[PDB]
Amino acid sequence: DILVVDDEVDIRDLVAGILSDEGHETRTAFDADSALAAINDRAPRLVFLDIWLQGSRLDGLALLDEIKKQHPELPVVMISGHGNIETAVSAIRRGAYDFIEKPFKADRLILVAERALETSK
């Protein structure tokens, strides 16, 4: 199972769509509280997290920290157009499996998801 967290509908749909077409059951969330509620209901096997979450209680990096604190075993991959070297290093040090830069190619998204799912329940 994959949970995609992004404040933009077009990105949630584009990511869930690409992954669903490859045979992965994908759910979406639009902010930190909808993401945490979706994980607390039934933990997915992988989480894709945006960083700049407009109107969210937590940005994607604080959300990564909260997810990794409750579920250290749950792989989390960042997907963001707001990265730089310092931000990507911070994400990996804080527990993210990988960092996908926006704009991404479909095969890169699938390659990373399947690598992370090999490291999941």
Residue 48 in contact with its own copies, rule: CB under 8 A? no
> Which of positions 57-116 make contact with its own copies (CB under 8 A)?
83-86, 88-89, 92-93, 98-99, 101
Q: Answer with the entry of its own copies, ligand BEF, Mg ion, none that 111 interacts with (C-beta below 5 to 8 A by kind).
A: none
For residue 56, what are the contacts with CB-CB under 8 A and spacing of at least 6?
Answer: 7, 31, 32, 33, 63
Asked if 18 and 61 touch (Cβ cutoff 8 Å), the reply is: no
80 lies in the site for ligand BEF, by CB under 6 A? yes
37-59 b/e (C-beta count within 10 Å ≥ 16 → b) = ebbeeebbbbbbbbbebeebebb
Annotated binding site: 6-7, 50, 52
Nearest approach, Cβ of 51 to ligand BEF (angstroms)?
3
Q: What is the C-alpha separation between 50 and 43, in angstroms, rounded?
A: 18
| Chosen from Mg ion, its own copies, ligand BEF, none, partner binding at 88 (C-beta under 5 to 8 Å by type) | its own copies
Q: Give the residue ranges of the annotated binding site for Mg(2+).
A: 6-7, 50, 52
Residue 26 interacts with, from Mg ion, its own copies, ligand BEF, none (CB under 5-8 Å by kind): none
On whether the CB atoms of residues 80 and 60 are closer than 8 A, the answer is yes
Which residues make up the interface to ligand BEF (CB under 6 A)? 50-52, 60, 80-82, 102
